Amino acid sequence: AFNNNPSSVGAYSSGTYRNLAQEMGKTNIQQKVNSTFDNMFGYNNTQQLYYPYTENGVYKAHYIKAINPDEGDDIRTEGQSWGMTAAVMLNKQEEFDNLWRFAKAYQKNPDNHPDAKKQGVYAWKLKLNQNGFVYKVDEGPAPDGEEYFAFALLNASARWGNSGEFNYYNDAITMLNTIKNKLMENQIIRFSPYIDNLTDPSYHIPAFYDYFANNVTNQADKNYWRQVATKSRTLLKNHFTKVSGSPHWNLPTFLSRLDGSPVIGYIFNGQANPGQWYEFDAWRVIMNVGLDAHLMGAQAWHKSAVNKALGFLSYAKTNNSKNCYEQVYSYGGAQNRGCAGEGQKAANAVALLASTNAGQANEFFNEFWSLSQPTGDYRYYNGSLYMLAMLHVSGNFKFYNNTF
């Protein structure tokens, strides 16, 4: 049965990881996790997201392909870093290494870039050109990519050691320094190096920062990352307070000020969507809340955040002619951007790690567990999230500490 009373002591401290799928009475859980990875990382062109990159017939590395039916396929740091995260959780070293090799070679902006703000950050969008060779479309970062890269690299170090192709640990510390020096404002993750007073709630993964603190060597840095963790929980708490009730109706948003206030409308040239939309980034927020609750302990704010968000989505589904909750809401209103797909359902299933409502858990968990693994043109984001959620709900998303 669903544990509707999640512990205030996290798995990171206790060593006890929940297996949400087991709580929900599912069987063949590990087989399903394993096949999810195998199909995502297999050469089937069906679920597959992991693709080799070759130059003049010479194998180089692999990437996570952001399939995109109308703007052209591209390659993103988020997906890359998520793929590495999945690989390390399942002990898939070659896959990890192939993706990290790609990132370091091709996504990383040089440390001597003329724009100091870009030095060592990871270009969020690459493409292959008409001759098949990789190039950077946008050198700006998507800072949760770096966050996941650091996370994944620290875990790789801890599981595999640092005497092979990669000194994972050194690469992780370098990534942490880059986050600190290039991607933070006042200890809050930036949306952009170029805009101040701006964060993206989905980039807040407090438990990662606590893990970082425990995996650096020097006292000042340990304190730094513990403070980032606390400030991240404060940001999320504040954001969830600000989105409660009217007018945001309990869903977190794409962009936020540093006090947690949703950004209203457009604020910069190139912005993809209004700041107050619950959209693709925002989907991940309650997944991150679930993660945090699982790994570092459930507090009242985690439970309220997820219970109220899931509650809104259930209500919104009852008020939808398609009998679905949708992918995009703004001020509690559906934006007609489609019924939830697999990624959103996956994010919501992970959120259950902070839920106290067994009825919500049954509904949201069964909707996720009944899905087939994503295929087709929208599988990059649906399938990347599906993979991460499979790990989270099967007790496979764990923190592996380094030993000093």
111, 119 contact by CB (below 8 A): yes
CA distance 230 to 219: 17
End-to-end CA distance of the chain: give it in Å, rounded. Answer: 39
Q: What was the experiment behind these coordinates?
A: X-ray
Beta bridge pairs of residue 188: 185
State the CATH class of domain 1-404. Answer: mainly alpha
User: Six-digit token pair at 360?
Assistant: 């919500």
Question: What residue ranges do the domains of the chain occupy?
Answer: 1-404
What is the rounded CA–CA span in Å between residue 355 and residue 368? 15
How many CB atoms sit inside 10 A of residue 278's CB?
31
Residue 22 to residue 29: CA distance in whole angstroms: 7
Q: After which residues is the chain broken (C to N over 2.5 A)?
A: none
Contacts 24+ apart (CB under 8 A), 47-50: 47/373, 47/374, 47/375, 47/379, 47/383, 49/79, 49/83, 49/379, 49/380, 49/383, 49/384, 50/83, 50/95, 50/99
What b/e readout covers 199-209, taking b as 16+ CB neighbours within 10 angstroms? bbbbbbbbbbb
Tell me the C-alpha distance between 303 and 312, whole Å: 14
Q: Which two tokens stand for residue 91?
A: 């002990």
- 64 near 53, Cβ under 8 Å? no
Backbone φ, ψ for residue 70 (5° rounding): -120, -25
What is the Cα gyration radius of the chain?
Answer: 20
Contact status, residue 112 vs residue 89, Cβ threshold 8 Å = no
HSE-up (13 A, CA, CB side) for residue 216: 24
Cross-strand bridge partners of residue 277: 330
Scanning the structure block, which residue is given the tokens 């063949």?
28
Q: Is the dihedral of CA 304, 3, 323, 326 positive or negative?
A: positive
Q: Compute the distance between CA of residue 392 and CA of residue 395 in angstroms, rounded to an integer.
A: 6
Residues 110, 119 contacting (CB under 8 angstroms): yes
CB-CB contact of 140 with 193 (8 Å): yes
Both structure tokens of 277: 């939309």
Strand pairing class (50-55; 58-66): antiparallel
d(CA 60, CA 386): 27
Burial class (CB in 10 A: 0-12, 13-18, 19+), 241: middle
Rounded Cα distance between 194 and 173, Å, is 24
Q: Torsion angle, CA of 71/380/54/153, rounded to 10 degrees?
A: 130
SS (H, E, C) the chain: CCCCCCCCCCHHHHCCCCCHHHHCCCCCHHHHHHHHHHHHCCCCCCCCCEEEEEECCEEEEEEEEECCCCCCCEEEHHHHHHHHHHHHHCCCHHHHHHHHHHHHHHHECCCCCCCHHHCCCECCEEEECCCCCEEEEECCCCHHHHHHHHHHHHHHHHHHCCCCCCCHHHHHHHHHHHHHHHCEECCEECCCCCCCCCECHHHCCHHHHHHHHHHCCCHHHHHHHHHHHHHHHHHHHHHHHHHCCCCCCCCCCCCECCCCCECCCCCCCCCCCCCCEECHHHHHHHHHHHHHHHHHCCCHHHHHHHHHHHHHHHHHHHCCCCCCCECCEECCEECCCCECCHHHHHHHHHHHHHCCCHHHHHHHHHHHHCCCCCCCCCHHHHHHHHHHHHHHCCCCCCCCCCCC
For residue 320, which of 332, 334, 309 has the smallest C-alpha distance?
334
CA 311 to chain centroid, in Å, comes to: 22
The structure tokens listed for 116 are 């100091």
- The angle, 0 to 180 degrees and rounded to 10, between the axes of the packed helices 143-160 and 206-215 is 50
